[PDB]
């Protein structure tokens, strides 16, 4: 896998409707491409992908 | 070019070598259009 590091998040908008009103961009530093499983580990907030 | 099997090059105008996964995937990945070309 990627030896994704140094991640931080920036939420670019957010609406709390019903469907997947926020968007947020995160920024990496990765050491090749790849796919990576993403998760959001509190229940305020999931995530579509 | 030509890295380890689970990698592609995908491009010939420099060397790019990225997941076989993102092969036909439905989005080209890099400067090169074989990503999705002739699938
Ligand atoms: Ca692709």
């Given at each position: 896998?990627?030896?994704?590091?140094?991640?931080?998040?920036?939420?670019?908008?957010?609406?709390?409707?019903?469907?997947?009103?926020?968007?947020?961009?995160?920024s990496?530093?990765?050491?090749?491409?790849?796919?990576?499983?993403?998760?959001?580990?509190?229940?305020?907030?999931?995530?579509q992908? | 070019?030509?890295?380890?099997?689970?990698?592609?090059?995908?491009?010939?105008?420099?060397?790019?070598?990225?997941?076989?996964?993102?092969?036909?995937?439905?989005?080209?990945?890099?400067?090169?259009?074989?990503?999705?070309?002739?699938?």
């Amino acid at each position: 896998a990627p030896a994704v590091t140094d991640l931080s998040c920036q939420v670019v908008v957010c609406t709390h409707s019903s469907d997947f009103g926020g968007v947020a961009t995160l920024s990496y530093k990765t050491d090749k491409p790849g796919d990576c499983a993403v998760h959001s580990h509190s229940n305020v907030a999931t995530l579509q992908e | 070019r030509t890295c380890r099997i689970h990698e592609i090059s995908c491009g010939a105008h420099s060397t790019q070598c990225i997941p076989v996964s993102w092969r036909c995937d439905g989005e080209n990945d890099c400067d090169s259009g074989e990503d999705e070309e002739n699938c």
